[PDB]
Design a protein around this ligand. Structure first.
Ligand SMILES: Nc1ncnc2c1ncn2[C@@H]1O[C@H](COP(=O)(O)OP(=O)(O)OC[C@H]2O[C@H](O)[C@H](O)[C@@H]2O)[C@@H](O)[C@H]1O
Ligand SMILES: O=S(=O)(c1cccc(C(F)(F)F)c1)N1c2ccccc2-n2cccc2[C@H]1c1cccnc1
Ligand SMILES: [Zn+2]
Length: 282
């Protein structure tokens, strides 16, 4: 915790100017339309626009710590609303254009946005989710579970059990959950397009998964304000706010960003909804 390498923190942000931002967002569209299999990888930068600071941005938790400053939250985790980005991902999966979702965030927003838990991998855990150490059943709570580092919460299992309930928050020592990791790994290997949103790609193995898509010749897109660890492996790099990138993309795809009903848990992905027909791309 004290010794832990927190990577490169506080690097400068890059702003594509607007004509270049438009041409790159069109090309991202172009790639989504030609792909058989898209996998989105997310990090802390998709939740900054709902009041949650990131780790390594100019005012992220590790950056500010290095300067002797505190990070600032403009919300509780319980009151946080999902961003436009979160909601765009909800809709892309409902229309069959997202195959699988890989995230490093523990903030619980992808589940609460209504995104299906069977197309989602929560690599670093989920602050609302506690797990039965005996039977492995998970409970998705309406408030954050008070502990981190896979400790006992003090509640017991209700399954038709009495096993000890534990948070799912990984500590620096802890290895990733295997279901989640193997699923994310399988998805990344078979993907023909991996799109990274608000991650600096510095944590392993979480940050390496998108590179798997490069094997067998897949394409890789990074959307990020700062430089990331794998910027030179990318076919397209977009330097912009993710909400502005996601909303323009959705408009090119002819899709609405749907309304959030408030906190909801969906275990299993629903049957695919109709979607616009695809443009002819020479
Ligand atoms: N609105 C935005 N639009 C685009 N990019 C953004 C925005 N806001 C922030 N960024 C970018 O968002 C990036 C966020 O990167 P980082 O802070 O390293 O977070 P991670 O999720 O990769 O952290 C990985 C793990 O490491 C930790 O120990 C925890 O274990 C995490 O689970 C920055 O470069 C910003 O420029
Ligand atoms: O910075 S933290 O307090 C934190 C967590 C674990 C370990 C440390 C350490 F540096 F002290 F080791 C700090 N912090 C945190 C704060 C409250 C609840 C949970 C977390 N949390 C868990 C993993 C990473 C963070 C992280 C975080 C998560 C999402 C958005 N913003 C920050
Ligand atoms: Zn149990």
């Amino acid at each position: 915790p004290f010794t832990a390498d927190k990577g490169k923190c506080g690097l400068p942000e890059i702003f594509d100017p607007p004509e270049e931002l438009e041409r790159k967002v069109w090309e991202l569209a172009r790639l989504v339309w030609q792909s058989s299999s898209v996998v989105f990888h997310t990090g802390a930068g998709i939740s900054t626009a709902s009041g949650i600071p990131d780790f390594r941005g100019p005012h992220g938790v590790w950056t500010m710590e290095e300067r002797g400053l505190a990070p600032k939250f403009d919300t509780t985790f319980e009151s946080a609303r999902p961003t436009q980005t979160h909601m765009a991902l909800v809709q892309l999966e409902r229309v069959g254009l997202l195959r699988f979702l890989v995230s490093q965030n523990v903030d619980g927003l992808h589940v609460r946005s209504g995104f299906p838990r069977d197309k989602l991998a929560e690599l670093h855990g989920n602050m609302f989710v506690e797990e039965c150490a005996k039977c492995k059943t998970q409970y998705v709570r309406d408030t954050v579970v008070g502990t981190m580092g896979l400790k006992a919460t003090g509640r017991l299992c209700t399954v038709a059990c009495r096993g000890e309930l534990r948070d799912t928050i990984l500590d620096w020592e802890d290895s990733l959950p295997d279901r989640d990791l193997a699923l994310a790994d399988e998805a990344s290997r078979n993907a023909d397009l991996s799109i990274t949103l608000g991650t600096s790609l510095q944590i392993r193995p979480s940050g390496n998964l998108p590179l798997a898509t490069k094997r067998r010749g897949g394409r890789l897109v990074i959307v990020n304000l700062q430089p990331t660890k794998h910027d030179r492996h990318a076919d397209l790099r977009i330097h912009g706010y993710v909400d502005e990138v996601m909303t323009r993309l959705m408009k090119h795809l002819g899709l609405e960003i749907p309304a959030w009903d408030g906190p909801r848990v969906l275990e299993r992905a629903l049957p695919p909804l109709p979607r616009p027909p695809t443009p002819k791309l020479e």
